[PDB]
């Protein structure tokens, strides 16, 4: 315990920042899908944003959250100030890779080490 605060004194204040970033991404998804001529649906993309913002829903510690948005903000900057081209963005969608089943029987049938 006894940790020093990075930018947010408590999960509460930190959550404020997450809200802002969500908004940012939400407002940006449409633009990217147009400035990058990505073949995705704005709605679809906006769900992806939600996915990511929740993939890390479990974090309880304020410090971890604060870094997470710093990093998140940095990603947005790379996508609104466009330095990240389609190949970079579409990677988020994991479009080419073949999905792996998580069913035990499925894995048994395919991989030595699951």
């Amino acid at each position: 315990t006894s940790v020093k605060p990075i930018f947010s004194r408590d999960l509460n204040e930190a959550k404020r920042r997450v809200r802002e970033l969500y908004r940012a991404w939400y407002r940006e998804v449409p633009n990217t899908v147009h400035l990058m001529q990505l073949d995705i649906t704005v709605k679809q993309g906006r769900d992806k944003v939600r996915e990511m913002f929740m993939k890390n829903a479990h974090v309880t510690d304020p410090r971890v959250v604060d870094l997470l948005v710093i990093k998140g903000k940095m990603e947005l900057q790379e996508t609104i100030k466009v330095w990240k081209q389609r190949t970079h963005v579409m990677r988020f969608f994991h479009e080419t890779e073949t999905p792996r089943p998580k069913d035990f029987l499925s894995k048994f049938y395919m991989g030595h080490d699951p």
């Binding site: 990075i6 870094l67 710093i70 790379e78 190949t87 970079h88 579409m90 479009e95 890779e97």
Partner: protein, 198 residues
């Protein structure tokens, strides 16, 4: 056997004491290697103060920042060991000030003290993940735009987790989990016999 002059190990040693005395609030340890190199060690909070004293003190002008680096000792609670190597063109001597930073306990930025650090601090964030407060524009410099993970951390796989190839179906470059055709052969090299007391 290399020639060693103790003139330096004495000069530098004294300076170390001088710095320590002048900045006792932050200097924890000040040592001179057997290689005649001083290495004041400061509490992370003393980043701004200790550097500034060295950049702007008549008896210790350390104008240029040779390098800012972060060794990563995973065992050490404070994983990273930010090391700042400085040069004094006036006194022809270099000193190294090294602090400790954990993954989520950021260090102050010295872009104010030396603007050379604007880039190296971005380099330390990209590779090791230490964060620098008050940095003008901290953002990945060396890694790919979408890279996930900090590469020079000792806990990051060399080959990494993603590699790129062009896929016709999608007519665009596409990451895939790394699949290597000859894994890095990890030769064990340490010998079971020590060399000297050290």
């Amino acid at each position: 056997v290399r020639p060693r002059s103790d003139v330096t190990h004495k000069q530098l040693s004294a300076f170390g004491e001088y710095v320590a005395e002048i900045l006792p609030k932050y200097v924890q340890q000040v040592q001179v290697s057997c290689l005649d190199e001083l290495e004041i060690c400061i509490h992370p909070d003393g980043v701004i103060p200790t550097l500034t004293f060295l950049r702007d003190h008549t008896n210790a002008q350390f104008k240029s920042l040779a390098d800012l680096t972060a060794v990563d000792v995973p065992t050490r609670q404070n994983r990273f060991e930010i090391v700042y190597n400085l040069l004094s063109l006036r006194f022809n001597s270099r000193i190294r000030v090294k602090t400790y930073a954990d993954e989520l306990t950021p260090i102050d930025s010295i872009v104010s003290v030396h603007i050379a650090a604007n880039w190296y601090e971005r380099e330390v964030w990209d590779m090791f993940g230490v964060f620098f407060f008050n940095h003008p524009d901290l953002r990945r410099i060396l890694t790919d735009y979408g890279f996930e993970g900090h590469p020079f951390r000792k806990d990051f796989p060399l080959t990494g987790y993603v590699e790129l190839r062009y896929d016709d179906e999608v007519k665009r470059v596409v990451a895939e989990p790394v699949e290597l055709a000859q894994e890095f052969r990890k030769f064990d090299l340490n010998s079971p016999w020590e060399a000297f007391p050290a």
